[PDB]
Amino acid sequence: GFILAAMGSAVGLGNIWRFSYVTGENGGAAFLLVYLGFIALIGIPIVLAEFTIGRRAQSDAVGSFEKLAPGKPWKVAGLMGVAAGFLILSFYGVIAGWILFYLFNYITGQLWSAPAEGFGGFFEGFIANPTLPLFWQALFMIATIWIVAIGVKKGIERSNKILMPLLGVLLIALAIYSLTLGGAKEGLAFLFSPDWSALKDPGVYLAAISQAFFTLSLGMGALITYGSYVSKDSRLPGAAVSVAGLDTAFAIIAGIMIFPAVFALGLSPSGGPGLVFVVLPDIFDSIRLGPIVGIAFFILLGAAALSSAVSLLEVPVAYFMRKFDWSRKQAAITLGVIITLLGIPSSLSFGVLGEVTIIPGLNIFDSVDFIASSVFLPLGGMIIALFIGWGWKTSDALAESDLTDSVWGKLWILSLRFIAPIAILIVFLSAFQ
Numbered sequence: 001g002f003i004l005a006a007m008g009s010a011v012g013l014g015n016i017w018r019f020s021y022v023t024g025e026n027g028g029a030a031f032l033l034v035y036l037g038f039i040a041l042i043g044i045p046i047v048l049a050e051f052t053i054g055r056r057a058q059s060d061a062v063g064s065f066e067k068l069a070p071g072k073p074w075k076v077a078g079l080m081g082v083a084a085g086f087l088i089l090s091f092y093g094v095i096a097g098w099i100l101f102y103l104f105n106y107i108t109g110q111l112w113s114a115p116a117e118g119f120g121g122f123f124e125g126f127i128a129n130p131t132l133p134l135f136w137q138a139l140f141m142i143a144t145i146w147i148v149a150i151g152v153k154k155g156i157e158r159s160n161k162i163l164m165p166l167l168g169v170l171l172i173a174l175a176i177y178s179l180t181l182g183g184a185k186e187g188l189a190f191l192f193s194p195d196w197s198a199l200k201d202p203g204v205y206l207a208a209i210s211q212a213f214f215t216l217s218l219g220m221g222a223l224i225t226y227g228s229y230v231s232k233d234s235r236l237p238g239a240a241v242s243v244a245g246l247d248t249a250f251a252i253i254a255g256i257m258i259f260p261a262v263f264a265l266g267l268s269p270s271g272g273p274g275l276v277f278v279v280l281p282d283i284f285d286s287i288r289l290g291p292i293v294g295i296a297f298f299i300l301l302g303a304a305a306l307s308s309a310v311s312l313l314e315v316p317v318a319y320f321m322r323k324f325d326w327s328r329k330q331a332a333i334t335l336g337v338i339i340t341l342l343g344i345p346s347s348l349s350f351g352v353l354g355e356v357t358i359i360p361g362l363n364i365f366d367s368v369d370f371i372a373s374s375v376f377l378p379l380g381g382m383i384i385a386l387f388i389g390w391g392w393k394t395s396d397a398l399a400e401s402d403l404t405d406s407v408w409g410k411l412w413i414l415s416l417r418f419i420a421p422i423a424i425l426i427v428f429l430s431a432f433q
């Protein structure tokens with residue numbers, strides 16, 4: 001039921017866009033290994049943790065901590081999630097803006113054939129433009145603010161009820177097609193033959209733990225909100241697995257679509273954020289009716305991004321209504337404008353503001369992404385796990401998580417109580433050296 005809504009949030013640009021350029025510049029299979037290891041040992045338990053919290057509390061993220069734990073400082077994760085909601089959405093609307101621009105050019109037929117400067121140069125010229133991405137960012141943000149304020153979200157999960165299975169099938173089709181382009185052995189080995197020297201590098205673990213929290217909509221309390229509006233019929237840990245498995249499925253299939261085509265096109269896997277925006281247009285170009293494939297793919301991906309951005313904007317909006325007694329439309333608009341303003345310099349980091357560094361060695365886009373995804377999400381996720389692991393009580397924890405008198409229940413508690421917090425902790429200390 002409402003578990004589909006959680007998948008609507010989980011599956012988005014993190015599965016196709018982010019997963020690609022993070023996996024690419026981090027070795028590939030070695031990264032993927034750690035990534036898959038984190039979803040299992042850290043991801044799924046914490047996803048189940050957020051479901052458990054919301055379902056008992058029957059409230060929003062930050063409100064859940066106060067109801068379950070009045071006055072206790074456990075709510076610092078919820079507050080940290082609010083800040084992450086601002087940061088992540090700020091640049092998320094920028095990448096989603098890129099999708100709408102690419103959608104437009106397939107509608108006008110400008111991307112049907114390769115431009116004079118090539119698809120790479122086309123994307124370069126677009127993001128180097130100071131004001132052209134800003135329009136499409138605003139256009140996407142306005143649509144997000146619109147849906148959140150009006151509260152019309154059944155336009156959204158009737159969408160991910162049809163459009164998301166369509167996205168999955170399309171990706172499966174494109175993944176198979178990409179393997180025929182002549183870079184299959186190079187692509188699969190990159191993705192599934194681990195380089196053990198990369199496991200020497202602590203930064204790989206931090207990138208994997210970041211992608212894990214990002215792709216699962218985890219660490220900021222977005223899933224806590226979904227869990228509150230889940231009836232008690234529903235076995236939560238099956239939901240947590242199904243959510244994690246489906247999202248993992250979307251990402252891995254996307255990798256099989258991208259990287260074989262990357263080596264086929266003779267591109268670098270460490271290309272950057274615009275990797276997919278260079279590969280896909282040429283794949284579609286190799287297809288005779290590829291413009292139609294292109295139009296369909298960016299309509300579907302845009303839908304997935306929209307349903308994820310609504311999920312993102314909801315976290316600060318729901319908070320500001322609980323704390324400052326704002327109306328839904330007021331909160332959505334005000335925060336919407338602020339977040340969009342916050343996204344402008346981030347979008348300019350691909351152009352005239354490329355020289356600016358905030359985090360040492362990282363531009364504005366990478367800095368915001370770092371602070372939100374590599375710091376806030378796993379730190380907040382740690383606190384959430386610690387909350388159930390130590391702050392809760394096993395009897396209540398297992399009761400809500402539908403894992404009473406089970407071996408999985410003890411295994412789940414063990415994850416949240418030690419294995420997950422220590423793993424995130426170890427990654428932190430090793431990375432910050």
Ligand SMILES: CCCCCCC/C=C\CCCCCC(=O)OC[C@@H](O)CO
Pocket residue numbers: 169172173174176177180181
């Ligand atoms: C809703 C029904 C199923 C979905 C659509 C069915 C098509 C799925 C996969 C088709 C992939 C075709 C790949 C093979 C191919 O055409 O190779 C051509 C070759 O010349 C290109 O290098």
Ligand SMILES: CCCCCCC/C=C\CCCCCC(=O)OC[C@@H](O)CO
Pocket residue numbers: 286287288289290292293296
């Ligand atoms: C009922 C249909 C719904 C619309 C869904 C979107 C359509 C997806 C793909 C359109 C047709 C693709 C055909 C493949 C193709 O043109 O390959 C030919 C070329 O590569 C070889 O000569």
Ligand SMILES: CCCCCCC/C=C\CCCCCC(=O)OC[C@H](O)CO
Pocket residue numbers: 131132134135138139
């Ligand atoms: C109907 C969408 C409204 C978007 C405009 C909101 C203004 C605030 C921030 C976005 C700034 C971008 C507007 C300028 C613009 O149209 O650029 C177009 C391209 O540069 C065309 O070459």
Ligand SMILES: N[C@@H](Cc1c[nH]c2ccccc12)C(=O)O
Pocket residue numbers: 009010011012013014015088213214215216217218219220222308309311312377
């Ligand atoms: N999971 C989504 C992005 C997302 C939506 N809500 C979130 C909350 C927290 C972290 C990430 C998200 C994606 O992969 O595209």
Ligand code: NA
Pocket residue numbers: 010011012013014015214215216217247
């Ligand atoms: Na995802």
Ligand code: NA
Pocket residue numbers: 007008009010011012303304305306307308309
């Ligand atoms: Na989505």
